[PDB]
Amino acid sequence: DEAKVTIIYAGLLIPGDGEPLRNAALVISDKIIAFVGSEADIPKKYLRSTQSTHRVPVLMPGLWDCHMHFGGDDDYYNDYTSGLATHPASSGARLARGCWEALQNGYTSYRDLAGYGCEVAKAINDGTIVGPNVYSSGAALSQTAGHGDIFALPAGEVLGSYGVMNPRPGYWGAGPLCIADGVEEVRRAVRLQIRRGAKVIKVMASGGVMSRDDNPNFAQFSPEELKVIVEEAARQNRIVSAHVHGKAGIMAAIKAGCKSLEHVSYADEEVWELMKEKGILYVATRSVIEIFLASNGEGLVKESWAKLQALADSHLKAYQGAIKAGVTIALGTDTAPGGPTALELQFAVERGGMTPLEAIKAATANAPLSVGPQAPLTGQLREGYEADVIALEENPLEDIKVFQEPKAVTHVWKGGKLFKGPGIGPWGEDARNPFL
Amino acid sequence: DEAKVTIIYAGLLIPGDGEPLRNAALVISDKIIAFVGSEADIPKKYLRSTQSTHRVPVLMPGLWDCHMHFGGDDDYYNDYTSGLATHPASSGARLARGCWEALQNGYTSYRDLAGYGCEVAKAINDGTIVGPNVYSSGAALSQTAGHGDIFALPAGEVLGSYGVMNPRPGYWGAGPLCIADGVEEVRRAVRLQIRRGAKVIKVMASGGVMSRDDNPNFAQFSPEELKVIVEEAARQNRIVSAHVHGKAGIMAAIKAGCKSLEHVSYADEEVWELMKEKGILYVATRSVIEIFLASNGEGLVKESWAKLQALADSHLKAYQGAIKAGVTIALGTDTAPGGPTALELQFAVERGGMTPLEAIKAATANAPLSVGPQAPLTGQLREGYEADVIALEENPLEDIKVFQEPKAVTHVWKGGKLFKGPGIGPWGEDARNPFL
Amino acid sequence: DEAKVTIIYAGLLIPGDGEPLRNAALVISDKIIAFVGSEADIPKKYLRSTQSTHRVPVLMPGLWDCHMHFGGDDDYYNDYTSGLATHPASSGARLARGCWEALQNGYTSYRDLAGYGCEVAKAINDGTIVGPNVYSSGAALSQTAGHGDIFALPAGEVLGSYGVMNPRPGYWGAGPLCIADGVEEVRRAVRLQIRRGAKVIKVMASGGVMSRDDNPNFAQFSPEELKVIVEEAARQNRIVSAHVHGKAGIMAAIKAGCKSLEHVSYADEEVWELMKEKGILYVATRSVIEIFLASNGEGLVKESLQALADSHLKAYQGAIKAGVTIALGTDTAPGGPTALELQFAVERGGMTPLEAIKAATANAPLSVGPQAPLTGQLREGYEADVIALEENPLEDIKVFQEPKAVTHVWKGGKLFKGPGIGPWGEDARNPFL
Amino acid sequence: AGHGDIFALPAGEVLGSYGVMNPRPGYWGAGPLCIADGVEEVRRAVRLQIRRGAKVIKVMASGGVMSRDDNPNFAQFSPEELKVIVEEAARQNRIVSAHVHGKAGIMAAIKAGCKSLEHVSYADEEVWELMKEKGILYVATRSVIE
Ligand SMILES: [Zn+2]
Ligand SMILES: [Zn+2]
Ligand SMILES: [Zn+2]
Ligand SMILES: [Zn+2]
Ligand SMILES: [Zn+2]
Ligand SMILES: [Zn+2]
Ligand SMILES: [Zn+2]
């Protein structure tokens, strides 16, 4: 019948791309952004129709983390074994709390690279719980003995749970991990994730630090296997995000047509010029490294000295030079939902050497590039884009660490609906118990 | 010893291709058509030998529906889940009633694109029941997460029932659906249907509206997989019929060598010129769209807004322009046997804009192109062609909706045997209880 | 909505139990029988309300066959192998034709002892097709190496298809046959049939002739296994029907609590007194024997008896003479020559036509015990399953072998065959529109 | 074929998911439902729940209305099977709660040693005196009906 209009005046309006605005105003018609500009120039059309108005210090688009892991693991096992042993109900319950906190922190979009993102996003989407927009990969695809693999378990236990062969009862094809070997098997692997509703595909294209036995210098999967994985994704209009450390894996991922790279630890002059020339998103995921450098190995298994300082330093140079060279960048934390995503911003500025303005851009305007065609117009405060907007109390351009205080976010709009705000309940506005 | 001759004089004789005839006569020696021409010019040879004679107002060849679905589903589940849950005995019993009604309506040939057509055609062929000529594909071949897939069930349950791996007791390889991924698996899939006696192969080469999660714009299967499927069919002298909506799937099906396309919703100038240049049958299957547009979504699941009006309109333009451009066309309803196939005729004329004469041609003379080399000489009232002939009471050229009245068909000949006629029993002429 | 009343006047009315009536009348309110008595004594309240009347020569209740086999096998394999190889879709299609012919012959109830009766009764019940009332056992339960078994196949192929272990895709638990060994396995076997909706349970409690290698003198299953099978049925208010030939199997079935016996070929004085004292239904199934004695065996496997044929006759005859409750079963596919069993009742067992009609009607619902409604008799309150004839069967019992001789067929008070009534019965409409 | 059973699915799909035979990947033994037939199988069924940490055991001891095809008048499981289920629970200091409607199922549950009954729809004079004399909890669950 009639559009639901909300007007928001802002002391400072940070739009995602382009300079921030002073004493500006933004309008929301229903689910989308109807106006952005200085407070003076608001259409009178909207002044007449609105039924809601807020004034806030700082206004900016909703934040994205682009590397998240919907695990909800039990705290029993230190390594990936928890992934398999944890019953998905326990995981689901925990992932609820995490998605809440995420939203409560102004994170309105997540790209889940391994986990139950697909299965949980439906409890979000029927409104049984609340959370960011979730763009899941279903399971990460890994070769046998790949970064995905659980080396501490016998191969049979692992491939029984996560292989693409021998269908069976017990939610075959719907785990955090998917082990495929060969061109035939990777086809089913890609397709099994699409079946769950995945909006991006994740591959382990090089060795990793979290897996116990495997070496990050070396590539994983064949060029043959990766080409197919990309093509399979491309046909359903997904893109592939590749986890890579060594240069070998990085170049294989680029050759195959992957469009997002994670960590990219051994990126050098050649890699940056490529990622630009080919328009590939670089996601450093620095948080993990800095968290554990400071931890000095609390929380990890002793074989995760793999990260070392050779890796830690290389990784930094890669991120820094990528910035300097002008590679498109977005921000990922590599943690559970509700984890300290805000940190990545800090490290963008302090370690990569961005301006706060650019770090905000990597968290907002650029972040939807992480799912390519599955993204709407969003991550920016601009007419026509999706009304995912948040309001602040302090100016992040002065202090970027402001995001690490959840109370500093006062208003949270996702799809033009208000989930956190003054005298707004824990499950957002006009909330009602879905079980009645 | 001696040929069984039947003479039929007709007020109007509509032959399938070429102008209709006035006050004509047709002869049947045994299983085939011995003469067509004006009543005056009957060979005296036949006048001397005949033991049967009928005069009817209108005479035309037996009708074909070219997209039918031998499911016989229980009415319990709304989606494809019924396909798996329904015991094939229940389906078989129901498909009997359907085949009867079909014949009773002057449908003497069906092309079953997914279902038990092969398994039921043997109860027809031993004469335990009666029905049209059935040309089944056995199961429709679909990729995992394809249009064939039952998304509401766990992947394991589905691939256990319908995969081409892990042979087992319980009629492995003989369902309504067949899920193959990769070049190796599609080979067995094609071959499993041939094993059942299938005379055509059906692929889902694009997303569909009836399946819950998948998007009709995008292609399905690899070009690699489809090439093989075509070649496998070609070697046994079958052809492949491809279900396609988006242009992407349409062009992939054409490149692979498919020779029938279903729906073809996003066909445009480029597609029509191809289907002609390459001699590919276009089967619109409009009934489904119009039935549910009028229903306004009664009978469907809420995620079948996929059809939308974007799809519904596009589809119409495709069909219309295909007609205008002179693409070879045949008629398919996409329903169970006994369903309202007669409707498709109406929509041919009223929506596609055919003349009634051309709509009859798409239901008769063209329809055997739908199975290529597996077709005899049939679907036309012409010397040497198979004696599948029906008689009417009213002239369909004046009113095409006449077919929607089953009583308007008074005589039904299949293989020169009379199944419906004056004082002819429910199981046709010289019928006897097969269980004595 | 007012009750739909139909009145039928009859020259002769044969009610099932009790003497037949002359110049009688019967009323049907909706699904059930509202009045039976002489034409004179019809309640006037029904004369005022009826919207239909018929007059027919002979009126009697709808017929039952109590041993039927919903197989719909392909004609390729001559033994039980056809059972496994035939795709159930082919079977279903065929079983449709059979059920039609059945109804068209005045058979309004069938007890299917092995086959797809449950799965097909679904297509009957939603009215997609027509057929008698079906009371299926799902699969017949047999031990390994039992009468059920397909000896010509390797044991693994058979138990993969029909065992109660190793669930899998492909309609596990829903075949013509079910092989269980041991007390634990027979519990699942009984239960798997109930799952399909079965209203009776069938066991092979002795060797048979239609299986390739087993001997009909010997018992099958353990007393232990049968006791459990009975108890499992009893808990869901089914009863067990046991196929038995040798005395050994017969007495084991009776001891376990089975309430219907099939063939009962070696029944003697002791068995008859038991079946009466315990109230167990005797179903001879003579048709098979006489069909193949006349065939001189053509159509069977060489492992088919003239000794057995005689014993079987004596059992049936003496059972009749001794007054055992009897019903009639042909042991064929639906549509098959059930009418014959009547003829043999009279001519071989030596019953009067009246008693043979009673075994096909009034007694026949005893074959499913508590699963039976009030039916199989033309009597007030009983279910309106009624048929009409042209000739008097009491004079010639062979009249049933002529399907035209049945002119009217009412099942559940709905008319499926009658004057100017279509092939799928009255007010029929294409279910696919 | 119990109240737990999903009748609209083929039996194999159901027992693959919920049976106590054929262990496999995919959280075998950890669903909403557990189908056991026979004394040997019910032992594992009770035990599989304790494995998950369960503090009570639930049996369907009669037909229900929320399952598609089964009749609430009739009992379910054998007295034999229930006795074992109770004993298995008792050994780990759990008790058994039985879902029952028909008197047949109610009395079989009481005889086996169940200590909580659900719905108890056909309870009468005899059942009440028993539940008191034996100290069995009655839980009506009226909400569903109303
Ligand atoms: Zn990673
Ligand atoms: Zn990661
Ligand atoms: Zn289609
Ligand atoms: Zn279709
Ligand atoms: Zn027998
Ligand atoms: Zn038998
Ligand atoms: Zn309950």
mmCIF file of N, CA and C in Angstrom, chain B residues 377-405:
data_model
loop_
_atom_site.group_PDB
_atom_site.id
_atom_site.type_symbol
_atom_site.label_atom_id
_atom_site.label_comp_id
_atom_site.label_asym_id
_atom_site.label_seq_id
_atom_site.Cartn_x
_atom_site.Cartn_y
_atom_site.Cartn_z
ATOM 1 N N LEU B 377 6.837 -44.446 -39.599
ATOM 2 C CA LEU B 377 6.046 -43.551 -40.412
ATOM 3 C C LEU B 377 4.659 -43.478 -39.822
ATOM 4 N N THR B 378 4.322 -42.323 -39.266
ATOM 5 C CA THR B 378 3.107 -42.193 -38.456
ATOM 6 C C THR B 378 2.791 -40.733 -38.210
ATOM 7 N N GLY B 379 1.695 -40.484 -37.508
ATOM 8 C CA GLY B 379 1.256 -39.126 -37.203
ATOM 9 C C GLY B 379 0.676 -38.406 -38.403
ATOM 10 N N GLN B 380 0.366 -39.162 -39.450
ATOM 11 C CA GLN B 380 -0.234 -38.608 -40.659
ATOM 12 C C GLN B 380 -1.141 -39.636 -41.315
ATOM 13 N N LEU B 381 -2.211 -39.151 -41.942
ATOM 14 C CA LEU B 381 -3.132 -40.016 -42.654
ATOM 15 C C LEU B 381 -2.645 -40.076 -44.082
ATOM 16 N N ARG B 382 -1.798 -41.064 -44.359
ATOM 17 C CA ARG B 382 -1.155 -41.193 -45.670
ATOM 18 C C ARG B 382 -0.750 -42.653 -45.909
ATOM 19 N N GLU B 383 -0.757 -43.082 -47.170
ATOM 20 C CA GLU B 383 -0.491 -44.481 -47.527
ATOM 21 C C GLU B 383 0.870 -44.952 -47.000
ATOM 22 N N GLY B 384 0.878 -46.114 -46.353
ATOM 23 C CA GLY B 384 2.082 -46.680 -45.754
ATOM 24 C C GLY B 384 2.303 -46.350 -44.280
ATOM 25 N N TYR B 385 1.728 -45.239 -43.813
ATOM 26 C CA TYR B 385 1.889 -44.797 -42.424
ATOM 27 C C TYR B 385 1.055 -45.649 -41.515
ATOM 28 N N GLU B 386 1.401 -45.605 -40.247
ATOM 29 C CA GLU B 386 0.780 -46.485 -39.288
ATOM 30 C C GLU B 386 -0.664 -46.081 -39.045
ATOM 31 N N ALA B 387 -1.549 -47.070 -38.977
ATOM 32 C CA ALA B 387 -2.978 -46.822 -38.826
ATOM 33 C C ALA B 387 -3.328 -46.389 -37.403
ATOM 34 N N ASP B 388 -2.859 -45.215 -37.011
ATOM 35 C CA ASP B 388 -3.307 -44.613 -35.771
ATOM 36 C C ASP B 388 -4.184 -43.470 -36.212
ATOM 37 N N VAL B 389 -5.500 -43.666 -36.137
ATOM 38 C CA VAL B 389 -6.500 -42.727 -36.682
ATOM 39 C C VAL B 389 -7.648 -42.505 -35.709
ATOM 40 N N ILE B 390 -8.160 -41.281 -35.670
ATOM 41 C CA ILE B 390 -9.315 -40.996 -34.845
ATOM 42 C C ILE B 390 -10.390 -40.272 -35.602
ATOM 43 N N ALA B 391 -11.620 -40.420 -35.119
ATOM 44 C CA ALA B 391 -12.768 -39.819 -35.760
ATOM 45 C C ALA B 391 -13.487 -38.854 -34.832
ATOM 46 N N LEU B 392 -13.996 -37.771 -35.400
ATOM 47 C CA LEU B 392 -14.683 -36.751 -34.623
ATOM 48 C C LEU B 392 -16.134 -36.525 -35.038
ATOM 49 N N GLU B 393 -16.809 -35.718 -34.225
ATOM 50 C CA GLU B 393 -18.215 -35.386 -34.386
ATOM 51 C C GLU B 393 -18.351 -33.937 -34.846
ATOM 52 N N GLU B 394 -17.419 -33.089 -34.404
ATOM 53 C CA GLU B 394 -17.403 -31.661 -34.744
ATOM 54 C C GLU B 394 -16.095 -31.271 -35.461
ATOM 55 N N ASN B 395 -16.119 -30.174 -36.211
ATOM 56 C CA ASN B 395 -14.957 -29.744 -36.975
ATOM 57 C C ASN B 395 -14.038 -28.876 -36.151
ATOM 58 N N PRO B 396 -12.862 -29.401 -35.796
ATOM 59 C CA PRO B 396 -11.913 -28.654 -34.973
ATOM 60 C C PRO B 396 -11.361 -27.393 -35.635
ATOM 61 N N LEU B 397 -11.415 -27.327 -36.963
ATOM 62 C CA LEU B 397 -10.904 -26.170 -37.674
ATOM 63 C C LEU B 397 -11.739 -24.934 -37.392
ATOM 64 N N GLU B 398 -13.039 -25.130 -37.139
ATOM 65 C CA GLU B 398 -13.936 -24.051 -36.709
ATOM 66 C C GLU B 398 -13.712 -23.757 -35.228
ATOM 67 N N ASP B 399 -13.844 -24.775 -34.370
ATOM 68 C CA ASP B 399 -13.600 -24.628 -32.917
ATOM 69 C C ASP B 399 -12.553 -25.642 -32.443
ATOM 70 N N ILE B 400 -11.400 -25.140 -32.018
ATOM 71 C CA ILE B 400 -10.275 -25.985 -31.591
ATOM 72 C C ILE B 400 -10.494 -26.562 -30.182
ATOM 73 N N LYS B 401 -11.344 -25.913 -29.400
ATOM 74 C CA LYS B 401 -11.655 -26.390 -28.056
ATOM 75 C C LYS B 401 -12.455 -27.701 -28.061
ATOM 76 N N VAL B 402 -12.801 -28.196 -29.242
ATOM 77 C CA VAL B 402 -13.594 -29.404 -29.356
ATOM 78 C C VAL B 402 -12.907 -30.595 -28.704
ATOM 79 N N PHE B 403 -11.583 -30.569 -28.717
ATOM 80 C CA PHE B 403 -10.781 -31.679 -28.183
ATOM 81 C C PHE B 403 -10.945 -31.819 -26.682
ATOM 82 N N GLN B 404 -11.307 -30.723 -26.024
ATOM 83 C CA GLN B 404 -11.538 -30.738 -24.590
ATOM 84 C C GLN B 404 -12.828 -31.481 -24.195
ATOM 85 N N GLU B 405 -13.575 -31.964 -25.180
ATOM 86 C CA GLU B 405 -14.712 -32.807 -24.910
ATOM 87 C C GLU B 405 -14.388 -34.235 -25.376
#
